[PDB]
Design a protein around this ligand. Structure first.
Ligand code: K19
Lengths: 99, 99
């Protein structure tokens, strides 16, 4: 599909067996999800943006389904105010910017 | 153009007569640029990101050219980690997400 940017580009995703709303975010290197209790091993990480840094948990090889398009990669979990789909998964679903 | 996302979507912009590099950021409502001198009046404002809120200078109706496309709108100037072009100007140049 084609998503205009009049409004936040929020879409439904499926991760860890849950449905959630997330931003398709070309400004995010990595994918960052709101606090959730995923199983498996993780590594601590810190990621920075406007206002400073937050501490997140890095999970690897996590399956996410974005508007029916499957993707698998690194997902960061932490106290973000919004679920963010970053470029590491946007490339996997064939997402491009066009103007 | 069609921009893929295996690399950061960095582009050259012209603002206040000066060339700068900026990130096309579909996850940003607003356009926030690093500290710089801009002509015209401004008002203090606050904006929040992943790490908290910062103080910015708000310049309204600023001319800004993004890869040869003209936009005129609000530009926030402050301690952002990177120059970001948000949806308020991405819409003006006709940018959409496609997958
Ligand atoms: C340094 C480049 C930008 C700031 C990076 N950000 C993604 C950006 O889309 C962010 C994503 C975001 C969106 C909403 C709340 C918090 C973060 N939006 C944002 O900060 O926008 C601000 C400016 O417009 C306003 O509207 C939204 C907030 C304001 S981010 O969320 O901090 C982010 C995401 C993944 C990531 N991986 C490594 S670093 C890193 C940083």
């Amino acid at each position: 599909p084609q998503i205009t940017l009049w409004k936040r580009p929020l879409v439904t995703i499926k991760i860890g067996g849950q449905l959630k709303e997330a931003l398709l975010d070309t400004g995010a290197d990595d994918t960052v999800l709101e606090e959730m209790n995923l199983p498996g091993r993780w590594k601590p990480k810190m990621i920075g943006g406007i206002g400073g840094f937050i501490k997140v948990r890095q999970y690897d090889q996590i399956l996410i389904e974005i508007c029916g398009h499957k993707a698998i990669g690194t997902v960061l979990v932490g106290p973000t105010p919004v679920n963010i789909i970053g470029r590491n998964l946007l490339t996997q679903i064939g997402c491009t910017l066009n103007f």
